[PDB]
Every structure is written in structure tokens, then in C-alpha cells.
Amino acid sequence: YDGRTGEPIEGPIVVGQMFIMKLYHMVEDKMHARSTGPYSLITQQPLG
Amino acid sequence: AEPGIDKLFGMVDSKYRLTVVVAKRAQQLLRHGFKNTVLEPEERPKMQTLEGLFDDPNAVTWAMKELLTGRLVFGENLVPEDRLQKEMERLYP
Amino acid sequence: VFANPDEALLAVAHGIVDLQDVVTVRYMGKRLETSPGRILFARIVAEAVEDEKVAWELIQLDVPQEKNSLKDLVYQAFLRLGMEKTARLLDALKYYGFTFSTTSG
Amino acid sequence: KLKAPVFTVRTQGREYGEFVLEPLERGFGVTLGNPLRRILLSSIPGTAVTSVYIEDVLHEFSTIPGVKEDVVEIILNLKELVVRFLNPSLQTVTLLLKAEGPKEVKARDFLPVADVEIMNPDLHIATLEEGGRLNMEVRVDRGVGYVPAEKHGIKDRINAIPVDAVFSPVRRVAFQVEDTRLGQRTDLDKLTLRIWTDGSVTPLEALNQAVEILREHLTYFSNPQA
Amino acid sequence: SKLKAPVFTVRTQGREYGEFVLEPLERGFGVTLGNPLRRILLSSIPGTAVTSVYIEDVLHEFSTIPGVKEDVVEIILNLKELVVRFLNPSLQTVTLLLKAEGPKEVKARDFLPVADVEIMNPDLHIATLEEGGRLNMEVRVDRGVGYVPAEKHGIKDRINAIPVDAVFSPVRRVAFQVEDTRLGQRTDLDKLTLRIWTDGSVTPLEALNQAVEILREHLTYFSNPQAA
Amino acid sequence: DEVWDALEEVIHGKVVLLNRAPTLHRLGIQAFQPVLVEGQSIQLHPLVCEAF
Amino acid sequence: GTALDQRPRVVVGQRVRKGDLLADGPASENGFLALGQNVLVAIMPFDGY
Amino acid sequence: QKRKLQVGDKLANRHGNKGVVAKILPVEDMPHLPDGTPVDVILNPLGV
Numbered sequence: 001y002d003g004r005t006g007e008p009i010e011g012p013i014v015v016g017q018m019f020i021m022k023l024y025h026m027v028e029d030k031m032h033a034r035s036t037g038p039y040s041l042i043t044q045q046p047l048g
Numbered sequence: 049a050e051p052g053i054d055k056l057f058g059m060v061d062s063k064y065r066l067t068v069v070v071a072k073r074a075q076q077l078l079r080h081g082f083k084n085t086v087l088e089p090e091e092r093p094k095m096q097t098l099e100g101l102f103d104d105p106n107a108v109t110w111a112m113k114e115l116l117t118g119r120l121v122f123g124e125n126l127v128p129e130d131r132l133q134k135e136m137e138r139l140y141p
Numbered sequence: 142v143f144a145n146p147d148e149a150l151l152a153v154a155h156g157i158v159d160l161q162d163v164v165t166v167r168y169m170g171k172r173l174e175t176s177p178g179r180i181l182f183a184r185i186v187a188e189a190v191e192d193e194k195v196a197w198e199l200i201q202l203d204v205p206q207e208k209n210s211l212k213d214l215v216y217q218a219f220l221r222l223g224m225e226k227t228a229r230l231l232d233a234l235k236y237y238g239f240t241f242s243t244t245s246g
Numbered sequence: 247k248l249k250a251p252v253f254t255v256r257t258q259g260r261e262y263g264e265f266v267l268e269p270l271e272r273g274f275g276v277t278l279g280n281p282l283r284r285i286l287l288s289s290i291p292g293t294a295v296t297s298v299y300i301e302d303v304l305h306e307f308s309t310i311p312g313v314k315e316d317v318v319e320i321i322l323n324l325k326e327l328v329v330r331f332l333n334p335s336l337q338t339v340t341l342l343l344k345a346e347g348p349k350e351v352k353a354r355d356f357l358p359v360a361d362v363e364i365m366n367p368d369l370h371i372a373t374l375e376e377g378g379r380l381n382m383e384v385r386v387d388r389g390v391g392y393v394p395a396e397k398h399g400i401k402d403r404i405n406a407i408p409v410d411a412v413f414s415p416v417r418r419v420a421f422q423v424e425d426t427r428l429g430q431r432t433d434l435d436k437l438t439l440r441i442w443t444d445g446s447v448t449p450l451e452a453l454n455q456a457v458e459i460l461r462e463h464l465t466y467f468s469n470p471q472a
Numbered sequence: 473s474k475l476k477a478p479v480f481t482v483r484t485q486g487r488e489y490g491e492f493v494l495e496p497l498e499r500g501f502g503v504t505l506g507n508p509l510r511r512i513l514l515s516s517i518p519g520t521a522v523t524s525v526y527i528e529d530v531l532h533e534f535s536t537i538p539g540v541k542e543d544v545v546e547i548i549l550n551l552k553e554l555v556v557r558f559l560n561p562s563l564q565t566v567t568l569l570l571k572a573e574g575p576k577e578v579k580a581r582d583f584l585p586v587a588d589v590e591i592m593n594p595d596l597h598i599a600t601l602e603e604g605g606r607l608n609m610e611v612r613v614d615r616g617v618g619y620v621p622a623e624k625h626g627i628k629d630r631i632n633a634i635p636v637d638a639v640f641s642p643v644r645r646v647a648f649q650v651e652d653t654r655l656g657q658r659t660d661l662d663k664l665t666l667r668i669w670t671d672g673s674v675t676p677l678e679a680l681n682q683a684v685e686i687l688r689e690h691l692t693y694f695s696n697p698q699a700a
Numbered sequence: 701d702e703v704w705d706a707l708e709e710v711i712h713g714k715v716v717l718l719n720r721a722p723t724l725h726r727l728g729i730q731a732f733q734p735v736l737v738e739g740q741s742i743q744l745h746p747l748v749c750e751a752f
Numbered sequence: 753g754t755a756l757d758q759r760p761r762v763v764v765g766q767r768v769r770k771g772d773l774l775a776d777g778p779a780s781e782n783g784f785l786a787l788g789q790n791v792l793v794a795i796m797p798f799d800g801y
Numbered sequence: 802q803k804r805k806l807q808v809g810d811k812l813a814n815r816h817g818n819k820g821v822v823a824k825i826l827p828v829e830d831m832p833h834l835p836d837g838t839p840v841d842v843i844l845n846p847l848g849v
């Protein structure tokens with residue numbers, strides 16, 4: 001059954017238990033932004 | 049898509065010319081604080097905030113709308129840049 | 142035999158017929174033996190482009206809509222209408238495709 | 247808590263309506279839109295052409311000499327006839343149409359009847375040439391929803407043809423729920439409802455009737471009879 | 473062709489299970505009534521939950537207590553299953569006190585009695601203490617609606633209190649069934665049956681009444697047209 | 701709270717450039733109007749995924 | 753950066769044979785490798801999400 | 802830090818199916834069994 005309407009999905013649906021793991025690639029550790037910051041010594045370009 | 053983008057693309061022989069014209073008009077609008085616009089107050093681009101409706105702060109939107117109105121003239125060697133700048137200051141302090 | 146697409150879709154809403162059943166619908170002054178789903182797709186395109194005659198010209202009614210036909214529809218809509226209306230049609234197609242894939246089963 | 251929502255109306259004529267309700271608590275957009283849509287499509291009272299009698303035709307797949315259209319075409323045209331009853335006591339109505347000569351038979355060619363109003367006199371019914379005749383007897387009832395012809399199959403006379411009864415005055419309803427924010431909260435709901443009717447009832451009246459029906463049905467959870 | 477008022481039947485099992493039957497209904501109205509009520513019951517029924525915990529000589533949630541088998545994280549996980557019933561509608565917050573010394577099996581019944589407050593699952597296991605272990609807890613329980621994470625409310629009474637994610641909804645499960653029924657000549661009529669499982673703090677009937685009230689109040693909102 | 705409203709004022713009408721490596725063709729960089737969202741993930745339109 | 757802790761799985765007075773589990777390690781459930789969770793899944797499209 | 806599952810985190814099963822969480826739905830919106838039990842995860846069949 002669809003939770004938004006209460007009407008059934010028009011066809012039978014495969015349903016069952018699955019083993020699922022969380023991977024260490026998390027958005028918390030990857031989101032990054034910069035306006036201005038430190039620069040390199042020689043090229044005077046932004047650091048990485 | 050931007051409103052009337054097909055019209056703007058058809059008003060010029062090269063799309064990059066349209067980009068140049070829009071950017072230069074936006075710079076003109078920013079320099080004079082929107083006092084040199086050819087829009088009448090009811091066509092002014094509006095922005096919605098909690099306080100209320102205000103003018104749209106984005107100058108590129110203003111320039112594009114003005115180009116849609118068709119009251120702007122663009123071309124090669126229309127007016128010497130120095131005279132244009134002096135007149136722009138004189139008309140709009 | 143339905144007098145207009147609204148009647149056929151109302152009959153669909155009452156469970157009388159399915160979207161995939163072949164019935165007779167009166168559309169554009171003509172009597173078409175088609176399915177309510179294909180009529181619904183034609184209406185989707187027509188309302189997306191805000192033009193009924195051009196939309197009727199663009200679509201192929203008597204075939205299931207697959208990748209090639211949808212791509213050809215997008216190209217023809219681009220040519221006939223421009224980028225703004227083509228993008229609007231693309232958004233409409235995306236919305237309705239997602240909606241109908243959810244409940245298809 | 248949060249303040250009471252704002253309800254906004256945008257009506258095109260007496261045939262189209264858009265209604266905006268915002269802001270709403272999370273998940274309430276569909277919670278309100280779906281039952282209202284079901285009631286609007288299913289339970290709004292109206293009137294519809296239910297049966298038809300034409301002479302010299304034995305079934306719906308026959309034809310009438312002197313008229314360009316077949317039986318199916320005039321029946322389909324009759325399916326879009328909009329009739330309004332002004333007094334609540336009237337239940338069923340019989341309309342007679344007399345047509346002769348080369349003419350463009352519309353709805354106004356129906357003979358006037360007390361306490362019955364034809365809302366689309368310009369609706370095209372038939373085309374007659376020289377020497378063509380059309381005598382028509384249409385039975386119109388009042389009901390709710392959509393009932394196929396085979397379900398009721400009520401035929402006044404022995405030659406009368408049952409007609410699919412489009413009782414619903416509402417032709418189409420769509421609704422959309424869009425995310426909206428208010429202050430720091432950003433998960434609120436905005437509900438948009440678009441209603442197309444046939445003109446016998448305005449979209450606002452249809453929405454009010456649907457809301458009233460839902461309220462009456464909610465009242466039913468009060469007295470535990472058992 | 474107006475339908476008569478349908479009969480409304482109630483069956484109850486304890487304070488936790490309820491069946492509510494409405495019959496007969498117009499065709500298609502079973503879903504029209506059941507689904508919004510199910511959504512409201514699963515979403516918007518107020519209840520009570522543990523919102524804060526303070527434990528003696530404990531500075532944060534990532535620690536252990538000597539003499540206690542479970543660390544603080546598991547203790548808080550256990551405490552999130554506590555069902556507390558407020559006998560007074562005006563009461564908003566309570567603080568339960570627990571003091572225990574090992575060796576024992578500290579359950580929910582060991583909480584000190586409070587007026588107008590009941591524990592609906594006194595057998596809920598909280599901790600295991602060995603000889604020499606001591607447990608001193610102050611648990612703040614609040615009224616609320618919905619699911620509020622600890623990082624949102626951030627409720628602390630003392631300096632060392634640990635905020636706890638609050639799941640206020642007292643309704644555990646909602647289902648509804650639409651069955652075939654008829655009345656004389658009418659056929660293909662609906663019979664609706666709502667099945668409600670709660671945790672005992674709120675009875676299924678009370679939750680159903682609150683859901684009906686919420687739906688009626690929201691239906692009220694369609695009464696003030698404004699021009700655009 | 702008001703700084704978020706100021707931020708909404710700042711980006712009005714402006715666009716940002718989204719790029720996915722490797723940039724095989726020019727459609728590997730595209731301009732979009734930013735809608736401010738909660739969370740830490742960029743939300744991408746389904747119809748530009750094939751180009752990217 | 754992950755936190756590794758051992759959680760006791762015995763009580764005082766319990767009889768333990770040779771090789772019997774005493775404490776679960778990280779990602780372990782009663783001596784079985786436990787890398788995730790068992791969840792109820794439905795295989796279907798959902799609104800493009 | 803105690804990290805909960807959020808939008809943008811990566812999940813996977815043992816058969817090579819991986820994906821980031823793109824939406825967290827409320828319980829009343831999830832598809833459910835006729836007995837009222839909602840599902841926890843919805844996987845797209847197009848990956849098979």
C-alpha cells in the first residue's frame with residue numbers, strides 16, 4: 001500500500017529482509033568550501 | 049530557462065555579442081545606482097523578502113529585461129567612450 | 142466510447158477501465174481507438190508546451206513511448222518552439238514519468 | 247506552535263479554480279489533498295443525460311438518413327449537455343427536441359420546461375439538410391459520480407438507448423504539494439488544488455461541498471453504537 | 473439516495489490495542505477516511521518521552537560506570553524505551569529519581585514514585601549491577617509531539633546532563649482494512665476497520681479522538697477566501 | 701537568524717558553476733541557480749546526470 | 753577514526769566452557785561478524801528519489 | 802561524535818549494490834504491508 005494515498009501499488013512488489021552496511025564515505029567528512037585562505041610559497045596560488 | 053532567451057538570441061548576429069551587451073548594460077546600471085534605467089516603475093524587476101517587495105538587486109536581470117523592452121541601441125562605434133562617460137556622470141550624479 | 146478525454150480519465154479514476162485498455166475517445170474532432178494512457182500522454186505534452194495543435198503534430202500517438210521516440214519528440218519540440226518551451230516540456234515529462242513509475246508496480 | 251494558514255483563491259470564470267493553502271505542517275499536504283480529490287471526483291451531486299429515444303433506429307450502431315452524424319455522435323454530444331435543476335424536489339426530467347429543415351440543431355432547440363435551465367444552448371447537437379427530421383426524447387436524472395450505461399440500463403421506452411451517466415459536475419481535479427519555509431522551519435507544506443467543472447457548480451462551491459462531506463463523515467466517529 | 477448513518481463499533485484489548493469498525497460506507501470512502509486518519513495517528517498524536525538524563529560521577533555519554541555491566545550509551549538506549557503516563561493533562565515535565573546499589577537487576581519499577589505519574593512498563597530492564605556498583609540517576613521526561621533529536625532541543629538541567637533523542641509519539645502501529653459489504657439493494661459498499669496499537673500511555677480511543685479533532689480543525693481552514 | 705535571510709538576498713538571481721571530474725566535454729561544467737538547502741549534500745537535477 | 757570497544761556478554765556466576773565468548777568486539781554480535789543492519793526493503797521506484 | 806544516518810551517506814549490501822541516501826521519509830509516507838508494517842529501505846529495480 002502507498003502511504004501517501006492508501007491505494008495499493010498496482011502490481012505486487014518484492015519485499016524482504018536485506019543486510020545493509022554503512023560505509024566510511026560520509027558527507028560530513030567531505031563537504032568543504034573556501035572563500036579565501038592560505039596561499040602557496042612560490043606560485044602564490046591557493047593551497048590544496 | 050531565462051525568459052525570452054530566444055528573442056535575445058534572435059536580436060543579435062552572435063550570441064557572444066548578446067553576452068557583451070548584457071554585461072556592459074549591467075555595469076552601466078550598477079555604476080549609476082539604477083537611475084539610468086529605461087524601465088518604468090511597473091516593469092521594474094521585483095524581489096520577495098519577509099519585509100516586502102523590493103527592487104531586484106541583480107543587475108543582469110535588469111539589463112536583460114531592458115533589452116527585451118527594445119529601448120536600448122547597441123552597435124559598433126556609436127559614441128566615443130569618453131563622451132559617453134562624461135554625459136553619464138552629468139545626467140546621473 | 143468517451144465523448145472527451147476528461148470522461149475517459151474520470152472512468153479510469155472510477156476503476157471502470159485501465160490506462161492500458163483500448164477504448165474509443167473523441168479528441169480533436171476525431172474518433173480515436175486508443176488507450177487512456179496515450180491520451181493522457183498527449184494531454185501532458187499539450188499542457189507542457191501550452192499549444193494543442195503543435196503538440197498533436199509532434200507526438201506519435203499509436204506507439205509506446207520509448208527512448209528513441211521521446212528523444213525525437215524533444216528534438217522536434219526544440220526545433221518548433223525554442224529552448225524555453227522545450228525545457229518546460231522536459232520538466233513536465235520528468236515529473237509525470239516519475240509519478241507513473243512509482244505506482245506502476 | 248505555528249499560526250493558522252492562509253487560503254488563497256484564483257478563479258477563471260465559473261469553470262476554473264486554483265486554491266492555495268500555506269503553510270501546513272509536514273505531511274499534511276497530501277493528507278488534505280487526497281481525500282478532497284476523491285470526494286470531488288466521486289461524491290459531488292449533479293445531473294446528467296441518462297437515456298435517449300430516436301425513432302427509426304434499432305441500436306446505437308445504426309444511422310439516420312438526413313443527418314450527417316450517426317447515433318454515436320449525437321449521443322456523445324448529449325453526454326456534454328449541462329442541465330441545472332433549480333428546485334430540490336425535481337428528480338427526473340424529460341426533454342423533447344423537434345427539428346426539421348436544413349438547420350443547425352443546438353441545445354436551445356429543446357422545448358422550455360419549468361424549473362430546468364440549459365447552461366450551454368450553443369452546444370452543437372446535429373446538422374439537418376433539406377428534408378431531414380430529428381425528434382428526440384432525452385431522460386435526465388440526478389446522481390453522483392460516474393455510472394456506466396450497462397450498470398443502470400434504465401430505458402423509458404422499448405427503443406430507448408441507455409447512456410453512460412456523467413453525473414459528476416467536476417470534470418478534473420489536480421493537486422500539488424510543494425515545500426515551503428517559515429522563519430527557521432523549512433519543512434512546511436504548501437497545497438495547490440486545481441478544479442475544472444462543467445459550470446453547473448463553480449469550483450469554489452464544489453470544494454466547499456467536498457469539505458462539508460468530509461466533515462460530516464468525520465462526525466460519524468462520535469457515538470459508539472456498539 | 474442519501475445513505476443512513478453508519479454503525480460505529482468498538483473492540484478493545486487492554487490500554488494498548490483497539491479495533492474501530494464503521495459500516496456501511498459509500499464505495500471508496502473507506503480509503504478516504506482511513507488514510508488521513510492513519511497519517512495523523514502515525515504523525516501528530518502528542519505523547520511523552522525521556523528528554524534528559526543525569527548520572528552521578530558521569531561527565532558524558534561515552535563513558536562507563538564501575539560496577540555496572542552496561543556503558544552509558546546502552547543505558548540511554550534502554551531508557552529510550554521507558555513509557556510514562558501523565559495522569560494530569562496540565563503537567564508538562566517530570567523528573568524521576570533512581571537510586572540503586574549492587575548486586576541487582578535495576579528495572580523501571582525501581583524509580584521513586586511521583587504523583588500523577590505512572591510507569592506503563594515496570595518490567596523494562598535498565599541495568600545490571602554487581603557487588604560494589606551504585607547507580608544514581610535523574611531522568612527528565614517531557615510532553616511533546618513528533619521526533620525531536622537531542623541536537624535540536626539540547627535540554628540540560630545540570631552541567632553534566634546528557635540530552636536524549638525524544639520520540640514522543642505514543643502510537644506504535646496503525647492499520648486499516650476495507651471489506652466488502654452491502655445494504656439491501658446497494659452493492660459494492662465499504663466497511664472500514666481501523667486497528668491501532670499504542671504503548672499504553674494513550675489508549676487507542678483517545679488517539680483516534682485526537683486524530684479526528686486534528687482533521688476537523690484542518691478542514692476548518694478552508695473557510696476564509698483571499699484574493700490573489 | 702537574519703544572516704540567513706541576508707544570504708538569501710545575496711544570491712538572488714546569481715548562478716554557480718558545477719563541475720564533475722573528468723571534464724570530458726564542455727557539458728562537464730554547467731551553471732545553475734542555487735537553492736539553499738539543509739544538509740551537506742549538493743542536489744542535482746536528474747536530467748543533467750547523463751551530460752555529467 | 754572509528755571507536756573500538758569490547759562489551760561484556762556474561763553475568764556473574766555464569767558457567768563458561770573452554771572457548772566460550774566472554775565479550776563482543778567491535779562489529780560483533782554474540783560471536784558473529786556484524787557489519788551492518790537487517791532492514792525491511794521493497795524493490796520499486798519511488799518518485800525519482 | 803555520535804553520527805546518525807543522514808542524506809549523503811553511503812550504504813551497501815554484500816552483492817555490490819551501493820548508493821547514497823538521497824531522501825529520509827517520515828514513517829507515514831513509506832509503503833506498508835496490509836498489517837500496517839512499513840518498510841525501511843526502497844531500492845530501485847533498475848540496478849539489477
Ligand SMILES: Nc1nc2c(ncn2[C@@H]2O[C@H](COP(=O)(O)OP(=O)(O)OP(=O)(O)OP(=O)(O)OC[C@H]3O[C@@H](n4cnc5c(N)ncnc54)[C@H](O)[C@@H]3O)[C@@H](O)[C@H]2O)c(=O)[nH]1
Pocket residue numbers: 025721722819
Ligand atoms: N574522476 C574520478 N572519479 C572517480 C574515480 N574513482 C571513483 N570516482 C567517482 O567516485 C564514485 C564512487 O566511486 P567508488 O564507489 O569506487 O568510491 P571511491 O570514493 O572511489 O572509494 P573507494 O571504493 O576507492 O574506497 P577506498 O578506501 O579504496 O578509497 C581510497 C582509495 O580509493 C581511490 N580513490 C578514492 N577516492 C578517489 C577519487 N576521488 N579519485 C580517484 N581515486 C580515488 C584511491 O586509490 C585511494 O587511494 C565513482 O562512481 C565515480 O563517480 C577516479 O579515479 N576518478
Ligand SMILES: Nc1ccn([C@@H]2O[C@H](COP(=O)(O)CP(=O)(O)OP(=O)(O)O)[C@@H](O)[C@H]2O)c(=O)n1
Pocket residue numbers: 721722
Ligand atoms: N579511474 C576512473 C574510474 C572511474 N571514473 C569515472 O567514474 C565513472 C564510473 O566508473 P565505475 O567503474 O565507478 C562504474 P560504471 O562503469 O558506470 O558501472 P557498472 O557498469 O558497474 O554499472 C566512469 O564512467 C568515469 O566517468 C573515472 O573517471 N576514472
